[PDB]
Design a protein around this ligand. Sequence first.
Ligand code: HEC
Length: 76
Amino acid sequence: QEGKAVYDKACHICHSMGVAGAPKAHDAAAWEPRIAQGLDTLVSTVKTGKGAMPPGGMCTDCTDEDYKSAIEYMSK
Ligand code: HEC
């Protein structure tokens, strides 16, 4: 899947406005410290969930590649 496609059907729900502290999409400054953790780490976190974010980020068919693509789209 394309990163933007994953975002538009799932991630945008909370990340478009940065609800409950979600790093806002296309906010490079907000995503920089999170990207710095390493993509492997971020993909793992999305799949297990983190606080207010539910495991999977409401994508029902996402591969690790899909998750990574989605993060890359949001991070700029
Ligand atoms: C609301 C129900 C969310 C949906 C749907 C998605 N995300 Fe999320 N995400 C959400 C919150 C509230 C937060 C902040 C959590 C915190 O306590 O900091 C996040 C954070 C992320 C992160 C950063 C995790 C980290 O280690 O700091 C990533 C990488 C992330 N979200 C990715 C992501 C993707 C790819 C999604 C779509 C598939 C997605 N999120 C959906 C809330 C919500």
